[PDB]
A = this chain, B = another copy of it.
């Protein structure tokens, strides 16, 4: 095991914003910021297609039961839909809304999931936005509405809101503008589950981690680190045909290429070599690629290494 962890953001500023939203026997989590509550529209019931708007018109404000964790019932005074997200307006604002921002997550981007049940955050864990717009989480009945976020420069960044479980340990949701990741629908129908490639830039960061942690107690470089390079332009051609995302320039990647000495390309060739066939000498104890440790996460933890 390494000293390079998949860090989670502290949840103080988010917990204050999570509430439960109930509508005619349906229950899930909502996100309270200002005088707006964001939650998945299916709290309205098992609908589909163009039914939502009609259902909303027929639904009534007072039928939406919203309760804070402190046991306070909030009154709803207006309702609307943005994409697959229902935004309920509260009579009074959340006095402790933090500085926040709705951002769209890319492939590889990592963030924290506030696993919630009944409006209460019961746990946290990191996840990465896969290539097929899904994420690998640990949700249970009622987890719907849980948000994905991180904290950067004192601003809460909301990237995700959980909507449903696509069979087999997979889940999907929207950003906070209401746009589903990928293009899956909040329905119980088809699961055209697209390609989930292994993120290349996270492998690079992870390899830079193994190298760094190995150098701390050895003189010799890892027995799996190739000496021959390959081109950025070249790796991609191989990636698309083998299930790997396209390598992209990253300041974080740069930062620690200049610190370890190794070059990204020696690492890329390593990916090819070990992908085609993994030897019998593990990287950080593993005989399989680590896909969710990001360049930024590795760089931020490197400082703690004994010089």
Contacts and interface: CB of A to CB of B under 8 A. Distances in A.
A193 B168 CA distance: 40
Interface in A210-229: 213, 216-217
A301 B142 CA distance: 10
A139 to B, nearest CB: 4
Contacts of A138: 3-5, 7, 301, 304
Contacts of A137: 3, 5
Nearest to A69: B12
Contacts of A301: 138-140
Contacts of A122: 10
Interface in A103-161: 114-115, 121-126, 136-141
Interface stretch (A24-32, A55-63, A279-287): A279-287
A90 to B, nearest CB: 21
A65 interface: no
B167 A124 contact: no
A169 B286 contact: no
Interface in A1-30: 1-12, 15-16
A78 interface: no
A7 B123 contact: yes
B304 A124 contact: no
Given A168-B3, A288-B287, A12 B16 contact: yes
A300 interface: yes
Contacts of A16: 12
A8 B114 CA distance: 10
B3 A136 contact: yes
Contacts of A139: 3-4, 213, 301-305
Residue of A3, A4, A216 with highest tally of chain B CB at under 10 A: A3
A304 B141 contact: yes
A306 interface: yes
A261 B15 CA distance: 39
A167 to B, nearest CB: 6
A12 B9 contact: no
10 contacts: A3-B168, A3-B169, A5-B125, A5-B138, A7-B123, A7-B125, A12-B121, A138-B301, A140-B304, A168-B217
Interface of A: 1-12, 15-16, 114-115, 121-126, 136-141, 167-171, 213, 216-217, 282, 285-288, 300-306
Cβ-closest 7 pairs across A and B: A3-B169, A139-B304, A287-B287, A3-B139, A5-B138, A140-B301, A12-B12
